Design a protein around this ligand. Structure first.
Ligand SMILES: Nc1ncnc2c1ncn2[C@@H]1O[C@H](COP(=O)(O)O)[C@@H](O)[C@H]1O
Ligand SMILES: Nc1ncnc2c1ncn2[C@@H]1O[C@H](COP(=O)(O)O)[C@@H](O)[C@H]1O
Ligand SMILES: Nc1ncnc2c1ncn2[C@@H]1O[C@H](COP(=O)(O)O)[C@@H](O)[C@H]1O
Ligand SMILES: Nc1ncnc2c1ncn2[C@@H]1O[C@H](COP(=O)(O)O)[C@@H](O)[C@H]1O
Lengths: 453, 453, 453, 453
């Protein structure tokens, strides 16, 4: 027992490293995925709902707002104040109901202007709490994806592309099963990663972010009891697609079913898996000495600690993404509430991802070629030239090729190759090209593929 | 120690229930995902490669084949014989190399016709083993997806759609947190599942199945050493997209990187997750007595054992899909061989999925309505009508609504509602509609949504 | 784009709900698992190492400390000041090395007293950073397990035991496959959970928490170069087992290999899995109306939201525990650094666990029996008495039992049973006991088992 | 569409590679975990139950059996015939109930001897199907663990121990973060793995395998209705602990709750995780050329394909173990049947494990030292000797050590070290030892630790 007094929350004392050691890397998510962010977006959705009712000619009891009333509401929806989130937390100490606390805050703000007080009972009109929550979650995911996550993903792809093109012509021994194999270029091996990452970026950006607004159980019961002549399905689709810029989900229960969150998180996890592969392969190239790493003055160790930090955080991110994708879309009957607490972690997998992306970018920026080590391994591996000799022998039908090639590989050297080539019953132009071969020259079209990535 | 003599393999003695208790449900996968299937497709790809070289004007050493030579090759590629797979296994006892054994089998078959013997050294010309493997895996996945998996997925969606439409008008108490909530219809709750499943079917069917053919390390080194003037990238894309009907992957190492396998398995897993949710919710409806189940003469128990079997097998399927998606796309440098053994399990997650799909279809086919139990719970829940009364009161600005509504809910009954409605300062047409309300009538537009699924 | 200004960290703006919405439930972990906690324990281990060297007669250059020198060091190790952790973070901005920053802080504190300044180069003597880290992690896990986690686990077991005993005699219909089955008592069904939880508590408490202190790569190289005559293995075991109260790991690389962290987290996850099962089953009993829940004045809904919050957080906890157990014990060669960032999340799975445990305790405290609903289902299920009638018929060899029992079940009622029993060729004492049977009486020895849990 | 005719089951056509490509490695599991094995053990448990009743003085209606009756029953329980499992499958085509089919088979065998026919209604007396299933599962797991899995685990530990001792004195450069670090010995790095594996072997062997026998819902209801004076709890514990050699679980529902299966599978997974780490590290040593691999005559490639196969199969095994541990112990109320189909896969994770263990043993047996490559890297790394020089300088208080040591490392060589050591204000005996240092000599006590593993 090493007991300790209570400590106030700071980045030093935060239990999770998302808000702790890595707070500086995750702070852009605080307006989005925190409880403040959830409250902010709940208030936005409530305000826009009330404004939609005011504009709706089928809802005469909410008349179109004056500029002054709109200005108050627009300030809540687009210039949200921390003091209101603090008040909502205070109200929640009584209600033990977080969306009801948002409602009460909005009624308190509406009370201050008579035009808004007169329609205060239309705040949240016919809504269930999940009508507000699901639209908040989609807006949070849209903001986190588009303004924080995707820019960093594209930064990684472009930083690796720059190196792929720079290093396109640098021949390098390949390793399969860890053992020497036909050469490539270092730029080609980096280009391969760019191509994979960009496929997943396109998939991440393409996921439709679904929303609904349809009352307690999905069927607009309360809406139709009060306003049987209003087309509430048309209103909902216009609100969600037009007013909010999301994609409409026409069939739900109390909750939006969360399949699109699984789709999005599965796509981010696939990007992260490619980046784990990259972090490990580059750790391996640095272990071989093929890359060296720039140092920063005053720092104390060069070890690839940024790639290692990235790899560790991508694993955590993907574990969380896998859990949320597997668990969120199962909900008992017209819903159970186990998803609410889980959805408070939408930002946590994204946080571990962007921590890793910043770390991978830092590691990439330190990479410098060590051409001497790359060339050392290549020039010590004339054995890679058995394959092209064998393939040319096959083209031209050289007799007893297995025995014949074994005369060379019992082994290969520049001089032994020159001698062996002249023994072969192949045309003169075939000999000219084989005699030019060196390990570093036997790269196929790696460089051309790399340059056009 | 209960020791036992050695047992030959049969469905009774198979260790895995895929080939054991459930062999009858998985037998359509035997020509596809088994070692026989892998061998079958390897032979197909080798044959089509040789035929592509024969047709290629840039490869004059392989002349276009006679009809008789094509007939032999076409028989290997489209009427494959188990005896050849058995011979390949025999050869492999020497080579300890499965694709090399395919090569040797093809050379043995080519030896039988002089036209083919003359080009036997062009079997597998310039290929690495993974050129054959990755195209085999894509063709296997295409066949399993299109001819076995997707038809069963669509059968489930259509069987649930039929019930959704049949039961569209059947009012039912909703349960949120397990507790009574505003009514729906049983058909609407089934329609919700159809909509989710069909989104994932579209995603499953839409995954592009990627292939490559580019030699040892991705760069066509051997091809270009023998045939420097042939456009091998164009040839590869035409082979893969045109001859084989797959999608070209232009950047790979020795292996195709397997991201599209993660994409496909992530999409099947999302379908399976919806079907787990359905299996559990229907188990719950059967527990409530809302559905009864038909019985089969002579069987001994009615318990929802087909839904339970389905739910158990979907969990196994998804565990395997998650592992393969997470692990396959990480491979050391220009590849490690840990993916080979894992890819022998491509069919196993699919097998557990189709076992579950058959079980869910069997359970669905047994479902029959128990309207008495559904109505019993609804008519015992007049409390659901507080919400519409409250919403109408809000529309018309009824004073002190919290206190006023509490006069009714201290509770609600047909008679107490009639009396309470007449107390309200609301228009006559609002009273007419509230006075018609019954729990079973308070379903919103559930039925119309359900009918158009 | 709903852009937002930068926000300082508070529980409202924290991205993770561990330090956000649930900060009040996790604050006891801040002195333990946060970066502050890691720093605190690193300083403790360094101080105790230096004190061990001072006491070691084989290290004459560090003489036993004066009381005044011990007092300074003891204050660092047992009354740690946030200002020192803040200074360490400042130093780390230069070093980019967190344990080196601890070293420099300790050298700054040692400079203030000449007796300590004279041995400042023995701070961290012969250590590698992981000698300090691994002992810190074990001490952190010990404190979190023993002082925070295990007390809450035992609170749950005892709270369920109290209800099991209270409800031991309350007969209840069982449900298997969701369908009626032979009765039990509600207390017996709760007792079953206590027994399972306490097995896992014993396993959690029993995990040995392993430590090492052996230099850069596990072999005491530096120690032996300077002090070849000191038994450094004996010193390490005495330090770890005696001075620190941990268990010695005699074989490591640079890192302690983390298997015991997998053992501990696997055991906590098994407890959590039982508690998920409990949270779901109780949600089901509340859905059946068998339990009602107390309400709190002023709160706004009764729904089992505490059990649902618990269930959601146990799933997150277990996802993190599974990842850390699977990934931490794999480390490249004599180590890679991917474990460091992952180990900053040791407290996060524990945090989600204790959030869930508090929520489950809150839900349990609200539970009250609804005996009317339990009895309603039982008295409507005379069909459960076919089984005992059939078993008695088997004991006494009643002829044609299948046909005979079918005469009764075509069904069972109190009166039909009285009549049927008199038809049976069984002894008088067998009839006496069958005639007493009622559904609520047919509970076996459930009550006696429940009372002794 | 490459359609194909139906294929009968063989190892070539099996969908799962457990019964397919790897059938030869898994065939020892066929009498244990297959449907045959499940049936075999169900028959064993039923027979032993009937024999327990015959011996029970409180069950006078089943008299102690003649030797002839025991011989028939003992043959069913200890010399089980495939023909009976085939008959059970035939009966199951009618019953659609697998344990009821076992009952009917046993009644058919009992009919053949009048002494057994007279007690045929005591076959399965008062049991529920899960009384037979759970005891079967525990006996299956015991047999698979003790007779197949643990022997292979110990074979791996001993094979690595043999190499650890053989290579105990072989100095080797360490790599941390992939970069050079203080030397070790190759035998020490292998010894570290032995120690970890054997901890998990002890845990695997120590798991108690739990059983119950207590009727439909855990409360002996039917037993007590027929035999109210028999102590059925004492009988159950004696049957399970004494007759069957298992451990008693006193609190269950219809099912044994499966926590001990999670405990066992978690322990096997921890062993497998260590073996993945080993497979990867050895793949790395082979990539460095530190080990070479023996070849087999006629085989065609040396690549570490056995370690790669092992690593791939351990990942699959652990994915299945994780799923079964997480899912099996959650069961709705007094049970749902989703566990039945999942438990048919108890042998599948074990199968992938023993495939991997055989592959790792094959790879280990091929390992041979390449002392030239190990020594090449060591003798090229005099930089490892900065650490001991620095530590000796600290012991003796050498002034301005940072600047002083930098005079040497701007670098280190045998000659520069000799010169630098003579500059230091340290005692003569300290210089004698520093002057002896070479990279290969700077291994600490690695060799002594390795030799006593
Ligand atoms: N049906 C519901 N829909 C939305 N929110 C709800 C519902 N029922 C309760 N809540 C509130 O949702 C919040 C859940 O908190 P948590 O479990 O911490 O995510 C609490 O404020 C609950 O009172
Ligand atoms: N680089 C390679 N590409 C493709 N197959 C290979 C390679 N190296 C070895 N193999 C063969 O792939 C098979 C792998 O078997 P398995 O590990 O059981 O999936 C064996 O027949 C190996 O000899
Ligand atoms: N071999 C090592 N052992 C322990 N810590 C190290 C090692 N190398 C670097 N570090 C430091 O460990 C910390 C890792 O930070 P993080 O990746 O955020 O957990 C940084 O301060 C690194 O400089
Ligand atoms: N309550 C029960 N306990 C044990 N087995 C059962 C139960 N109810 C049904 N079964 C049988 O268990 C088997 C389950 O098959 P599967 O789902 O393929 O594992 C079928 O033969 C069912 O009829």
């Amino acid at each position: 027992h090493h007991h300790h007094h209570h400590m106030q929350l700071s980045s030093l004392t935060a239990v999770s490293p998302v808000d702790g050691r890595y707070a500086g890397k995750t702070s852009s998510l605080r307006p989005i995925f925190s409880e403040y962010g959830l409250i902010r977006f709940r208030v936005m959705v409530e305000v826009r709902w009330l404004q939609r009712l005011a504009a709706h000619a089928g809802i005469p009891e909410v008349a179109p707002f004056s500029a002054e009333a709109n200005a108050l509401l627009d300030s809540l929806a687009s210039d949200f104040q921390l003091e209101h989130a603090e008040r909502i937390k205070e109200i929640e100490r009584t209600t033990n109901h977080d969306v009801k606390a948002v409602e009460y805050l909005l009624k308190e703000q509406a009370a201050k202007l008579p035009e808004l007080a007169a329609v205060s009972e239309f705040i949240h009109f016919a809504c269930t709490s999940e009508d507000i929550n699901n639209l908040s979650h989609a807006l949070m995911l849209r903001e986190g994806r588009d303004s924080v996550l995707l820019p960093l993903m594209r930064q990684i792809a472009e930083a690796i592309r720059e190196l792929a093109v720079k290093l396109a012509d640098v021949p390098m021994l390949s390793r399969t099963h860890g053992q020497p194999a036909s050469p490539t270029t270092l730029g080609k091996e980096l280009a391969n990663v760019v191509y994979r990452l960009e496929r997943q970026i396109k998939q991440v950006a393409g996921i439709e972010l679904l929303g609904k607004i349809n009352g307690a159980v999905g069927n607009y019961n309360a809406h139709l009891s009060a306003y049987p002549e209003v087309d509430w399905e048309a209103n909902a689709r216009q609100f969600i697609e037009g007013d909010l810029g999301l994609t409409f989900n026409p069939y739900t229960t109390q909750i939006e079913p969360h399949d699109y969150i699984a789709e999005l998180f599965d796509a981010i996890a696939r990007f992260n898996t490619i980046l784990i592969d990259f972090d490990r392969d580059v750790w391996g190239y640095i272990s071989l000495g093929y890359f060296k790493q720039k140092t920063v003055a005053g720092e104390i160790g060069v070890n690839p600690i940024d790639f290692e930090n990235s790899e560790g955080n991508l694993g955590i991110a993907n574990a969380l993404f896998q859990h949320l994708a597997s668990k969120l879309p199962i909900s008992r009957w017209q819903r159970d509430l186990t998803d609410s607490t889980v959805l408070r972690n939408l930002g946590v997998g994204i946080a571990h991802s962007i921590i890793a992306y910043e770390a991978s970018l830092k590691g990439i920026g330190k990479l410098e070629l060590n051409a001497q080590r790359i060339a050392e391994d290549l020039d010590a591996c004339w054995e890679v030239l058995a394959e092209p000799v064998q393939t040319v022998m096959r083209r031209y039908g050289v007799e007893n090729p297995y025995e014949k090639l074994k005369e060379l590989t019992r082994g290969i050297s520049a001089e032994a190759l020159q001698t062996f080539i002249e023994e072969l019953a192949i045309p003169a132009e075939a000999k000219v090209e084989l005699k030019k071969l060196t390990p570093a020259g036997y790269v196929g079209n790696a460089a051309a593929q790399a340059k056009r990535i």
